Amino acid sequence: GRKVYFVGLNEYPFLPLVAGLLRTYAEQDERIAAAYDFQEPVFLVAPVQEMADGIVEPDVLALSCYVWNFRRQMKVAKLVKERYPNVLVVAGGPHVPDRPGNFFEKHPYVDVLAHGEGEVAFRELLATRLSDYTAVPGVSVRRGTEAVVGPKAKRLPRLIDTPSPYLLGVMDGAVATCRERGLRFYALWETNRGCPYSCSFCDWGSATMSTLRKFEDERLQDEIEWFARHDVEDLFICDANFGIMPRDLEIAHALAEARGELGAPRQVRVNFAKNSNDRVFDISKTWHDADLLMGTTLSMQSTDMDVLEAIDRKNIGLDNYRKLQQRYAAENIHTYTELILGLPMETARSFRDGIGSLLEAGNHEDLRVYELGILPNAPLNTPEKIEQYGLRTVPKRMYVETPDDEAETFEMVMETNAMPRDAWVESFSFIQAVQFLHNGCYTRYLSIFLRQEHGIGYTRFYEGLQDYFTGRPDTVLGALYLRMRSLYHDYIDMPALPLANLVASQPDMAADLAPYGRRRGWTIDNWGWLRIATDFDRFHTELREYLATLGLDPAGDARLEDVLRFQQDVMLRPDYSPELGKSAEYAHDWPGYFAGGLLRPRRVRVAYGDQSFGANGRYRPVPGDLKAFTMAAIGTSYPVSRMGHFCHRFESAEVTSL
Numbered sequence: 001g002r003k004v005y006f007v008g009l010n011e012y013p014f015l016p017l018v019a020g021l022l023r024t025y026a027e028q029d030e031r032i033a034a035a036y037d038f039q040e041p042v043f044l045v046a047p048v049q050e051m052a053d054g055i056v057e058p059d060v061l062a063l064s065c066y067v068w069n070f071r072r073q074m075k076v077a078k079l080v081k082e083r084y085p086n087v088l089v090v091a092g093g094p095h096v097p098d099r100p101g102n103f104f105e106k107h108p109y110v111d112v113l114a115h116g117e118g119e120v121a122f123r124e125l126l127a128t129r130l131s132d133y134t135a136v137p138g139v140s141v142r143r144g145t146e147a148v149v150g151p152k153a154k155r156l157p158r159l160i161d162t163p164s165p166y167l168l169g170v171m172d173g174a175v176a177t178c179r180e181r182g183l184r185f186y187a188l189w190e191t192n193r194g195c196p197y198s199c200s201f202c203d204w205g206s207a208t209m210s211t212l213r214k215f216e217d218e219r220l221q222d223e224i225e226w227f228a229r230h231d232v233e234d235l236f237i238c239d240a241n242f243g244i245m246p247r248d249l250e251i252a253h254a255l256a257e258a259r260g261e262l263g264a265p266r267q268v269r270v271n272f273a274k275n276s277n278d279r280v281f282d283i284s285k286t287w288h289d290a291d292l293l294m295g296t297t298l299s300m301q302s303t304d305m306d307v308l309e310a311i312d313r314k315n316i317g318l319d320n321y322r323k324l325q326q327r328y329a330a331e332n333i334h335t336y337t338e339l340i341l342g343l344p345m346e347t348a349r350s351f352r353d354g355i356g357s358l359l360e361a362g363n364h365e366d367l368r369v370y371e372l373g374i375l376p377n378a379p380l381n382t383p384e385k386i387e388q389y390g391l392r393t394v395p396k397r398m399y400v401e402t403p404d405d406e407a408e409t410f411e412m413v414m415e416t417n418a419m420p421r422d423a424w425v426e427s428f429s430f431i432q433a434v435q436f437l438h439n440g441c442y443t444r445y446l447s448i449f450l451r452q453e454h455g456i457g458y459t460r461f462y463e464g465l466q467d468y469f470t471g472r473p474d475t476v477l478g479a480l481y482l483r484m485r486s487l488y489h490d491y492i493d494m495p496a497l498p499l500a501n502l503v504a505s506q507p508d509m510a511a512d513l514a515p516y517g518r519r520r521g522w523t524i525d526n527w528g529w530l531r532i533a534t535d536f537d538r539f540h541t542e543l544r545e546y547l548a549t550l551g552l553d554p555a556g557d558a559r560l561e562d563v564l565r566f567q568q569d570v571m572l573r574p575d576y577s578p579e580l581g582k583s584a585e586y587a588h589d590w591p592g593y594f595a596g597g598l599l600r601p602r603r604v605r606v607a608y609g610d611q612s613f614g615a616n617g618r619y620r621p622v623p624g625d626l627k628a629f630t631m632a633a634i635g636t637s638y639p640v641s642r643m644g645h646f647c648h649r650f651e652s653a654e655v656t657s658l
């Protein structure tokens, strides 16, 4: 038969869902099923030469192209086309340009591009290859080096009734392949397709600004059971806005029941709906109780009205955000908020003010920031919009590498009309410090106390930290701010400094963290937290000196001394023993205060008895074991770990009046 090869490389093990969807949809044509021999998908990373050599006698080479695999898959296609002149090279995925232009001049070894959702176009291509391509909807066809655009794509109907690659068993080989090689994997799952909104930076599922289409109910329920029956522990749901549809609560309950009855799945990653509502809360409560929840998305991208207008995004208001934070915090349900640095119209002033406003509104635990990437088919990637807002980009490698044509690259915004490059660098350093100091707890409780009892706003506190300590190179915190300043300037100037391995690519920063573990995906956030952990006592000595510059010398303020001791003691330290615990005495009931109660000068004994850390309590500290300390203190670098980390859980500690 005509051998069909799929290549869709992922750095982390994700099951090849696209290959399964395209094959099983196409196999509904009995002539296609009989004529074509679909090979096992290539989705685990291997050397380019080795991947090309594994493609033997191909009739069709199907490339599933994303920012993380486009260049290597083009190079494989180049090598395969040299060996097999008659192979049909078809590239789809969100990195395929909507407007190909001179694409085939750069990639003459590619024959057909598929745009957006690919089921119909791929099935029509395979059928046409058997018949006695420019008539196929949803594709562009190479003619010489020119791109001939075919008819517009045919989307699947509002109710998507297509074969499931999971239920048909065509994902079995990939699952076994991961397990044979000792790899944990994510199963990818869709319950619907599209996003109804229009954020200009986004290209979610190649289907933003789209009417929502649902996968049929019975297929989804059967797939839930399939995941549970096959011990698929890690499930990644691809929906843009989970909770946006009424049935999403029923889906959440069905996943919780499957977890309860069969033990799988164990964790569910999903992006929760932009217009967060009671259904998102009910889903989150359900999955929190079932230990499935990985954080409730309450993302903003920006808080500035001009920025939000420029990117066509409406957010929940700040006061409504505050009410959400209060409701989730009361249930101990973890939420997180994403921001993007360098959006149109964002100034360094508006960016820092927005960060402070989110802390003011009650998010102290989980703020996440991304560099703005220009995606090929995002609305922002037009000459008009790039010109309108003055977006300046630099090519940025994703990974440490090797020829340039095998290094994956994206275009990273690092300057706009509103944010000069220098302001971008300092703003990025600012939010990293907010993450490891505030989300990381080191100064979170001091900052809250200073805000609520001494009138020091959140933005002002962390601006002052940066302004003061950047002028003191020999301090713990000053060294971090200055190293981040040079790192991000090099990051702009040197494209090879990778997005996904930045800390690991710097020998000094990698050496800082070497006693704590061997990781390729250390974040700057992790690095700052562990650098402070290393020089913890001196950090607090120097912190007292910064407080004196605010007029708040602790040597004359007994209450400030008291909260500083609480702030020091609450942090998890390498010598902590779950068998011994950790206790101290204070002049105020700090646990009750930071739980939301009134500040009362009540002399207390606080006894910390933490046995484990992390979301599921699956990291146990071992005194003297820096590797076990790191897992309990900060968890994994990927995925982001912020539930149950950093500090002792004083809300459960034994607090006794003296």
Ligand code: B12
Pocket: 009, 010, 011, 012, 014, 017, 018, 021, 022, 062, 063, 064, 065, 066, 067, 068, 090, 091, 092, 093, 094, 095, 114, 116, 117, 118, 119, 121, 122, 188, 190, 202, 203, 204, 205, 206, 236, 237, 238, 239, 240, 370, 373, 375, 376, 377, 499, 500
């Ligand atoms: C799961 C996921 C991840 C996983 C990785 C998944 C993997 N390794 O395979 C993780 C969580 C690691 C991840 C990370 C990132 N992601 Co992501 N991710 C997704 C998500 C939610 C699902 C992808 C998926 O499997 N979809 C389901 C499949 C079935 O749908 P599909 O991709 O649209 O496929 C269809 C069509 O494209 C077409 N098609 C696809 N391949 C082919 C091939 C052929 C031959 C044909 C004919 C057709 C065809 O047919 C398919 C079926 O209809 C998407 C959004 C989404 N819902 O698609 C973003 C998405 C892929 N991610 C995106 C981005 C930008 C990233 C990051 C690089 C940056 C960021 N998020 O800020 C980071 C990584 C940063 C870092 N430090 O490394 C972009 C990618 C855009 C692009 N041009 O590549 C997306 C589209 C989201 C967005 N912001 O618009 N991601």
Ligand SMILES: C[C@H]1O[C@@H](n2cnc3c(N)ncnc32)[C@H](O)[C@@H]1O
Pocket: 201, 202, 203, 271, 299, 301, 338, 339, 340, 370, 371, 372, 373, 374, 375, 378
């Ligand atoms: C899922 C999350 O990914 C982030 N996100 C989406 N598109 C981009 C992009 N082009 N650049 C950077 N971050 C992005 C947003 O913060 C979104 O909430």
Ligand code: MET
Pocket: 204, 239, 240, 241, 271, 272, 273, 274, 297, 298, 299, 300
């Ligand atoms: C998938 S993007 C993050 C979730 C939601 N669509 C939002 O923008 O807030």
Ligand code: SF4
Pocket: 195, 196, 197, 198, 199, 202, 203, 204, 208, 240, 241, 274
């Ligand atoms: S950021 Fe979220 S709401 Fe905005 S277009 Fe992307 S998926 Fe839709």
Ligand SMILES: [K+]
Pocket: 206, 207, 208, 377
């Ligand atoms: K689009």
